[PDB]
């Protein structure tokens, strides 16, 4: 985990792609994502748990 090191509540393209498993590990309850990012606020994750489902496509 974080080991009590600082994190910026702000989110990366790496650590973006983390919310992306538990929208399947806690199934749309922002939270419990969270925790697996680690020790975020849930304000970003609400924002961008609308963003995942804009990109979903049926041509793939």
């Given amino acids: ?14 650590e973006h ?5 538990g929208l399947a590990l806690f199934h749309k309850d922002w939270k419990k994502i969270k925790e697996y990012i680690g020790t975020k ?11 995942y489902f804009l990109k979903l496509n049926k041509t793939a």
């Fill in 1 to 14: 985990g974080p080991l009590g090191s600082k994190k910026r509540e702000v989110w990366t393209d790496a």
């Fill in 41 to 51: 606020t849930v304000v970003q994750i609400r924002s961008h748990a609308q963003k």
């Fill in 17 to 21: 792609a983390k919310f992306v498993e």
